[PDB]
Write a protein that binds this ligand. Structure first.
Ligand SMILES: *[C@@H]1O[C@H](CO)[C@@H](O[C@@H]2O[C@H](CO)[C@@H](O)[C@H](O)[C@H]2NC(C)=O)[C@H](O)[C@H]1NC(C)=O
Ligand SMILES: *[C@@H]1O[C@H](CO)[C@@H](O[C@@H]2O[C@H](CO)[C@@H](O)[C@H](O)[C@H]2NC(C)=O)[C@H](O)[C@H]1NC(C)=O
Ligand SMILES: *[C@@H]1O[C@H](CO)[C@@H](O[C@@H]2O[C@H](CO)[C@@H](O)[C@H](O)[C@H]2NC(C)=O)[C@H](O)[C@H]1NC(C)=O
Ligand SMILES: *[C@@H]1O[C@H](CO)[C@@H](O[C@@H]2O[C@H](CO)[C@@H](O)[C@H](O)[C@H]2NC(C)=O)[C@H](O)[C@H]1NC(C)=O
Ligand SMILES: *[C@@H]1O[C@H](CO)[C@@H](O)[C@H](O)[C@H]1NC(C)=O
Ligand SMILES: *[C@@H]1O[C@H](CO)[C@@H](O)[C@H](O)[C@H]1NC(C)=O
Ligand SMILES: [Ca+2]
Ligand SMILES: [Ca+2]
Lengths: 87, 641, 641
């Protein structure tokens, strides 16, 4: 959003904890179904559901952990992620 | 759909394992094309063949461009080199040379002969025997012919004989002749500065480079007869054979006669263009020389082979396969590259107002395949990073290794010499130029020769198809990498290391500069200003969107003219055409400023102090002005306060 | 609610109905700012006032610039003129002149005296007596002082005296003395072609236009005392006083002594900008001169007052009202505008790299108000159509009718004189320019004298406010017409009449061009190619979308360099700077070719045939080169066949 020619800026942030102890960060987690038996490593070719393309907890951190485990061609990223995740 | 990079180099290799260069290099060596001087009939038949091919490959537009020039050709009378006795009675001759030198003088003289190593200025000032009034002999190689004749003209000699020894040039046939242009500078010399079309009506003029002394090329076996009569030994520091001798005996003295006549001949240039889809008017020029003096397969054969096969390849990839370029590509075959490259220089002086700021890279395919061992490149610094990435993709033809063996190669690169055909694009026009060769450590023996032909070429290189495949692959990486993307791959970071090299070269003379009463600090701050301009531009590529085009055009125009702003705006383009302050010729360039400065220490009287003050002012303000024009608008230049 | 041209014109007129120029002319003439020599302290306080006002009107960036220039002021010894015999013993003192000519050489000489009417180049042949070996007097007016000193210096004279008669300059006071610069050319002379910044180390260099002879100004009663001793009678073509005489008596003699010393002063330029919203980096410059030798109420107060009020109206109209200009606007206050306007010329030669293709119009608000009878414009011809429409929308301040009264005014327009501040921009940089005056039939009499004060200007022009309002309205019309719309209003077809006038002028000397052995017809065809170029470009403005921006930027980049391609690329900018083939000085422009052919019909032996044929080749290929640069690309030519 701040790239030219948009040139924007955050004006008001929001906090998530209780009122008396305000918290400005939020953790990112990866939910699975029980008794499937695959780890973070042996994750290849499993289906996944994201929250959007370019959002923080959905695209940048989960692909951001594992983008170097993919084989080249690295870019465009959605192509090689599209061949990593089956569906 | 779309095609990205890794798909596209794969598509190039799939188009490239099918083509055959060997049959085409046989085709350019048939008996219907084989002697082709410029303006000859065989040149025009080859130009009709190429101009037919650019139509048959379905190029977007094919066009011809002709103009009339003045070359020099042999006379119907022979030119000889002939030993004269002191008696004047018995006269003995050494050779009637089959090969001649272009742009020499029609004259005939006698006198003493004095050996010189290569005709470096260092050689002439290292000599013991006085040079003046005496014909000289030099060995071909390490310098252009024209600078040999230029130095031998500055030391007031009469005659120049040029030959090929065996140590630098190992061959078997001792009776062999060759060819060279003697014009210092480039272009058609009888029209300097303005183009040689038929609109100028050919006013009387003459260049500055043309010597006033007869030049002649002799064979090795002719040099053995002259070394049979001389005496005084070659010093051992010259890595030479055992026969060369310094000066003539006091009895005999040689007689050089050279008789050449001017001629005015018609020059054809053939072009074909592939259009672009986002920005069609910006383009990139790919060239090759179309002729050579002898049979000519090393000089102009491999260039025209690579050019025809590349035009087939990219026209086929755009038409059938689905590749989509963003900028146009011009493929070009000009003639008369052998007379100091007039076919290209007369084109640049022709259309300079139209390719101002438009053409952003020239590529040279000329003399691509000579040796099989090494890989040598010579380029503008803007292209260096580009070549680095290409050396990490292409494989060697003989061994399975990559080209990127030496990770420290940016210092070994030598600047573009004047006998290269990419030099008037870089130094005169301001287009970033690149040339390359697979070259063996010693240079190629019969390169301007009557024995340059496909038989002896395939004797030297036993696998020519694979090496031509590699060189066409490298030029493919350059064109595709320059054209498919929205971001140019000209790397403007690279001039900064040149500037650090220059100011660091001036710090060792800060002691002499401080004695004159003038400081050096403004030139340091000029280097710093160019640093902050390039860093600011890189960050402005950091903040730009990539899919947007209107904010990437404004950042690409600033990249395109970082080469044009190093051309000096304080000289006349007729009086001295090569105006690039780094890589030029005259009194305005930066090693001319160093070469002016180091002569003050020896205290001869050759230093010119007022000239040094003007050179410091104009070099400082040219570098500082490029650093203003790379960073932002007018108001965003920060002044000295 | 967008703003179109009608709302914006009535919005500008609602702004001009309110402002009061007369208080600001009275404010730039207060006792704390009144004597403004270049670099003196009284310039500085006005300069901080103008920078302070530009900060106060909320401009988007206000920035300043200071650099050091050599001027030439009066020494402590008084230069003077005196009448002596052949020995020197007869001494009769004429006077001691208050005014002085800057850049006149410092020397003392004697000699007899010869008159000339103005020192036109036509005058010295029409004169009876030989000029050499003798001092001349000339009469002030109709040409610059530098052309008088250059002509009389070109015919071997020794000194020049300058006076103001009663017929051309009717003034009551017969004591008044005056000022003028004598550099032929523009700018700081001791740095020719490069800027006077202290980055450039101040090298020893001397401009090639400075004179060699002592030049001096005298008053009117000081001239008549010399007319008492001189014997003769003027021709009746010279409309003059009754008391002029041609030459001295034979026993008489005139010695003048001139003592002027160089000084090194500090120069300021004060700038402000208004940013643009579509294209910020393209801008239009509006200037003014800040200092003048006398009080300077007609020469600097009116220009600076109009500049400050245009800053108020445009910054007010962008901030409050809702105007949105698509291009930036630079307001400028040049200092030392009187020694040949060195502020502007050192500003261009400083920042020529950053102004390359960016700036595209200057407007000169200098000497706008001089009388109330006529309206006299002088501009580069791309603005002519623009001035057409502006002259249909500005009412004359005295009579209520419009200013476009004569339907044929494009032929009455004279070219830009060298003392005008727009002439370094148009002639040197290739930027379109315009100046304009409300000039009376006779020129403003006391312009560069000490008599130029405010109350004389309000007595000469009785309603200064409405006239200054009309000139401010014309400048506001120009600035809005260039920077509101997606289309530039630079009309490029107006050059076609200029090329037709040139070739039609050479078509009378076709009979001698056929005698030399070269045809003219290639230059006919060059004019034709420029016509089909501008026709094809008018078609491309026809078939484009107006809403789209990426195609109109590609066309406006092709219009914005129709002026740069008339700068001749074959001459050094440092040697002969004014490189414009139409409108500039040198041996390369088109009047120099018409002159250099016109000499041959005299059969004097003075014409230079090689220089002619060379000039014809360069001028022909320059016109054909601009024609190729307009019409499309490299492959859409439409070449030889
Ligand atoms: C372009 O210039 C060339 C050079 O003079 C002209 O070619 C010559 O024309 C003359 C007369 O027609 C003949 O001697 C030959 O045809 C040409 N001479 C040589 C040496 O080639 C040519 O005619 C000019 N082009 C035009 C259109 O006038
Ligand atoms: C050293 O530089 C000076 C620069 O002034 C040269 O002197 C003059 O240079 C101008 C160039 O505009 C020539 O027109 C003059 O003819 C030169 N005068 C002389 C006496 O040479 C000078 O030529 C340079 N070289 C040397 C060896 O002094
Ligand atoms: C840049 O140039 C100016 C002019 O040459 C220098 O100003 C002069 O400095 C000396 C030394 O202090 C004074 O004697 C002169 O009077 C100064 N000139 C004027 C016109 O006042 C200036 O010092 C130089 N350097 C800088 C950093 O501005
Ligand atoms: C006429 O033009 C010629 C060509 O420029 C002049 O001749 C020479 O011009 C060169 C400049 O290129 C200078 O070295 C000299 O002016 C001339 N050199 C000589 C004569 O050896 C010539 O001076 C011009 N004027 C006249 C009256 O002929
Ligand atoms: C130039 O050559 C002649 C040859 O006779 C020689 O005598 C003379 O010394 C040479 N000039 C100089 C300066 O040595
Ligand atoms: C120049 O003046 C002298 C004397 O004043 C005269 O003899 C000479 O003829 C003049 N020169 C010319 C070209 O007339
Ligand atoms: Ca030429
Ligand atoms: Ca200057």
């Amino acid at each position: 959003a701040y790239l030219a020619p948009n040139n924007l800026k955050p004006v008001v942030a929001e906090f998530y904890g209780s009122k008396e102890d305000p918290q400005t960060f939020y953790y990112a987690v990866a939910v699975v179904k029980k008794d499937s038996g695959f780890q973070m490593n042996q994750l290849r070719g499993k289906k996944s559901c994201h929250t959007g393309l370019g959002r923080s907890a959905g695209w940048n951190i989960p692909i951001g952990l594992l983008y170097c485990d993919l084989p080249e061609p690295r870019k465009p990223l959605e192509k090689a992620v599209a061949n990593f995740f089956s569906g | 759909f779309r095609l990205y990079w890794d798909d596209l180099k794969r598509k190039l290799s799939e188009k490239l394992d099918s083509t055959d260069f060997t049959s085409t290099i046989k085709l350019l060596n048939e008996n219907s094309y084989v002697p082709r001087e410029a303006g000859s009939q065989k040149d025009e038949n080859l130009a009709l063949y190429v101009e037919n091919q650019f139509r048959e490959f379905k190029l977007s537009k094919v066009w011809r461009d002709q103009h009339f020039v003045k070359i020099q050709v042999k006379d119907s009378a022979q030119n000889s080199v002939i030993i004269v006795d002191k008696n004047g009675r018995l006269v003995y001759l050494v050779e009637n040379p089959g090969g001649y030198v272009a742009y020499s003088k029609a004259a005939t003289v006698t006198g003493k002969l004095v050996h010189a190593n290569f005709g470096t200025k260092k050689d002439f000032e290292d000599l013991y025997t006085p040079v003046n009034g005496s014909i000289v002999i030099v060995r071909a190689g390490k310098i252009t012919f024209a600078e040999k004749v230029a130095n031998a003209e500055s030391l007031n000699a009469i005659g120049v004989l040029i030959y090929m020894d065996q140590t630098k040039f190992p061959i078997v046939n001792a009776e062999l002749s060759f060819f060279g242009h003697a014009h210092l500078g480039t272009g058609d010399p009888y029209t300097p500065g303005f183009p040689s079309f038929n609109h100028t009506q050919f006013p009387p003029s003459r260049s500055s480079g043309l010597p006033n002394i007869p030049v002649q090329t002799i064979s090795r076996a002719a040099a053995e007869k002259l070394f049979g009569n001389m005496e005084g030994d070659c010093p051992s520091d010259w890595k030479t054979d055992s026969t060369c001798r310094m000066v003539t005996s006091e009895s005999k003295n040689v007689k050089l006669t050279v008789s050449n006549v001017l001629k005015e001949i018609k020059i054809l240039n053939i072009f074909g263009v592939i259009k672009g889809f986002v920005e069609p008017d910006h383009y990139v020029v790919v060239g090759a020389q179309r002729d050579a003096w002898g049979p000519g397969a090393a000089k102009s054969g491999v260039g025209t082979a690579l050019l025809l096969k590349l035009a087939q390849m990219f026209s086929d990839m755009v038409l059938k396969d689905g590749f989509q370029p963003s900028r146009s590509i011009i493929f070009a075959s000009w003639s008369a590259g052998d007379f100091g490259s007039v076919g290209a220089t007369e084109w640049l002086e022709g259309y300079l107002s139209s390719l101002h700021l438009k053409a952003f890279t020239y590529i040279n395919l000329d003399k691509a395949v000579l040796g099989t061992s090494n890989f040598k490149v010579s380029a503008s610094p803007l292209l260096y990073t580009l070549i680095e990435k290409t050396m990490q993709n292409v494989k060697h033809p003989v061994t399975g290794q990559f080209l990127y063996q030496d990770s420290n190669w940016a210092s070994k690169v030598e600047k573009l010499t004047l006998d290269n055909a990419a030099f008037p694009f870089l130094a005169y026009s301001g287009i970033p130029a690149v040339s390359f060769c697979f070259c063996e450590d010693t240079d190629y023996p019969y390169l301007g020769t009557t024995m340059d032909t496909y038989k002896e070429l395939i004797e030297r290189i036993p696998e020519l198809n694979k090496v031509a495949r590699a060189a066409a692959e490298v030029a493919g990486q350059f064109v595709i990498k320059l054209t498919h993307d929205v971001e140019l791959n000209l790397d403007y970071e690279r001039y900064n290391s040149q500037l650090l090299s220059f100011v660091r070269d001036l710090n060792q003379y800060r002691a002499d500069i401080k004695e004159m009463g003038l400081s050096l600090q403004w030139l340091y701050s000029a280097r710093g200003d160019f640093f902050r301009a390039t860093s600011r531009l890189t960050t402005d590529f950091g903040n730009a969107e990539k899919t947007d085009r209107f904010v990437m055009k404004k950042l690409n125009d600033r990249v395109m003219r970082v080469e044009y702003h190093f051309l000096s705006p304080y000289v006349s383009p007729k009086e001295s055409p090569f105006r690039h302050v780094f890589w030029g010729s005259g009194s305005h360039t930066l090693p001319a400023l160093l070469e002016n400065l180091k002569l003050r220490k020896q205290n001869n009287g050759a230093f010119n102090e007022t000239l040094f003050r003007n050179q410091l002012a104009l070099a400082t303000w040219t570098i500082q002005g490029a650093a203003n024009a790379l960073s932002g608008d007018v108001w965003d230049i920060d002044n000295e306060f």
